[PDB]
Design a protein around this ligand. Structure first.
Ligand SMILES: CCCCCCCC(=O)SCCNC(=O)CCNC(=O)[C@H](O)C(C)(C)COP(=O)(O)OP(=O)(O)OC[C@H]1O[C@@H](n2cnc3c(N)ncnc32)[C@H](O)[C@@H]1OP(=O)(O)O
Length: 432
């Protein structure tokens, strides 16, 4: 079959991270849990023709957006292809409730599983929800985009659209090619760097135990996350974290403390999503992120400062080795097939939420952030702002909306009490 020879000749292997997504997606091919999505609210007038010109330009510039996947006897393969696509424009301003109609439209798209060999793998759409209020909806499959990549694209699209609105030529894009991302990952897989990283992680999680969880059960995730959202003032942590790093340290320390106070587990392993973007990888939209195991030991009557100490140590030791995939680590330690290294992940996203489109201000709002195996604490923070957005994303098989809400309210309060006195022992604090 010359047809099969040609597909193998004209394609590239998936990266390790892409492969892990592909395998998980194959387990539940009808589950939409690997869709990621957000919308950008623009407080102004958008011209859809110019917006679509900007999207065409960024689809040329971010070639991950033109990735095509083709199955082979040696697994899924990819190439820079020729996806057909369109930008729907919906004026919902005459609806009884335009905001709800916009949410319903976006949800109708992101609830649908993407077929990886047919696409479309992304969706871009414009939804007018009030006079001078527009929403730009962005949806991706996780195999070809992660959070930082989506952030890079939204920034570029805002920039290009603003230049085209002004009638000037957009300055040259600084994105690299997804091909160089793939080649660098291919070299990592056979690298001595990876052998070192693996050694560190095997030594680090030498032996384990069932992860502390807030649910009555552990189950695979098949449905879209249950989400509870709270907006919090960053005054409520003091100056504990004027820093993305220290914010991640505080969020992990607090979540570990909550898990201990609620479950009695003293060895709490959390998942810490990381970007895995050094050097040139910082400018290549596509799928790159990893999730590290982060171990926090709850000593007798220890305080918040101690826990944050411990978390900072874990981060400063393990972040250098962040390229080693956590599922590779799982397999290599020889764990039971279905059992995780962590159930609760702490996803801190210090990405600027603000944009400007044609002199009009805009803000980003997450809709989907990946699968919620158990519980994921998503934290959105524009560096410098005094405001955080905190999501509890949970597996619907393991949590109820109101149980999750009660946990979030208890945790938010607990968290504010901890940051109100980092020296207080965590056993000594009442919780709702
Ligand atoms: C469409 C909707 C979009 C949203 C969908 C999201 C879907 C997803 O699930 S994808 C995941 C999204 N989440 C993320 O990307 C997580 C981002 N957050 C984080 O990475 C962590 O929380 C955070 C904030 C602690 C990372 O902290 P950060 O300071 O950036 O560390 P990082 O840049 O990774 O590297 C630092 C360490 O790497 C090590 N390192 C190794 N090599 C190098 C190198 N060449 N250069 C620099 N550091 C290196 C060093 O030890 C370094 O430590 P230090 O700077 O102290 O010397």
């Amino acid at each position: 079959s010359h047809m099969d020879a040609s597909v193998m000749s004209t394609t590239y292997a998936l990266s390790a991270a892409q492969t892990e997504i592909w395998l998980a997606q194959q387990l539940y091919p009808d589950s939409p849990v690997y869709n990621i999505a957000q919308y950008t609210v623009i407080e102004g007038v958008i011209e859809p023709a110019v917006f679509e010109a900007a999207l065409r330009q960024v689809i040329d510039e971010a070639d991950t957006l033109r990735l095509q996947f083709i199955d082979s006897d040696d697994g899924l393969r990819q190439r820079i292809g020729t996806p057909a696509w369109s930008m729907p424009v919906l004026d919902l301003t005459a609806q009884a409730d335009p905001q709800a109609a916009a949410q319903a439209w976006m949800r109708a798209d992101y609830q649908q599983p993407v077929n990886l060999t047919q696409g479309p793998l992304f969706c871009y759409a414009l939804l007018k929800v009030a006079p001078a209020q527009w929403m730009w909806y962005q949806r991706y499959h996780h195999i070809m985009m992660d959070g930082y990549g989506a952030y890079l694209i939204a920034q570029r699209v805002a920039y290009v659209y603003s230049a085209l609105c002004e009638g000037t030529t957009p300055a040259e894009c600084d994105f690299g090619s997804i091909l160089q991302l793939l080649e660098s990952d291919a070299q990592y897989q056979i690298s001595a760097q990876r052998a070192q990283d693996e050694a560190y992680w095997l030594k680090h999680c030498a032996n384990w135990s069932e992860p502390a969880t807030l649910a009555s059960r552990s189950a695979p995730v098949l449905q879209q996350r249950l989400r509870q959202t709270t907006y919090l003032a960053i005054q409520a942590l003091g100056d504990t974290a004027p820093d993305a790093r220290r914010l991640a340290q505080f969020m992990t320390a607090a979540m570990a403390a909550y898990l201990y106070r609620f479950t009695g587990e003293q060895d709490v392993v959390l998942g810490l999503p990381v970007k895995v973007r050094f050097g040139a990888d910082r400018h290549i939209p596509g799928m790159k992120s990893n999730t590290l195991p982060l171990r926090l030991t709850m000593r007798p009557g220890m305080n918040l400062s101690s826990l944050m100490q411990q978390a900072a140590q874990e981060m400063q030791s393990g972040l250098r080795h962040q390229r080693y995939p956590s599922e590779a680590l799982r397999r290599q330690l020889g764990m039971p097939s279905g059992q995780r290294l962590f159930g609760t992940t702490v996803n801190v996203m210090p990405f600027d939420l603000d944009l400007s489109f044609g002199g009009y201000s805009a803000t980003n709002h997450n809709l989907l952030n990946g699968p919620a195996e158990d519980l994921m604490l998503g934290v959105y923070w524009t560096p410098g702002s005094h405001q955080l957005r905190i999501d509890f994303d949970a597996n619907p098989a393991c949590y109820t909306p109101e149980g999750l809400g009660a946990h979030q309210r208890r945790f938010i309060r607990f968290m504010q009490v901890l940051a109100a006195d980092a020296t207080q022992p965590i056993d000594s604090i009442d919780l709702l």
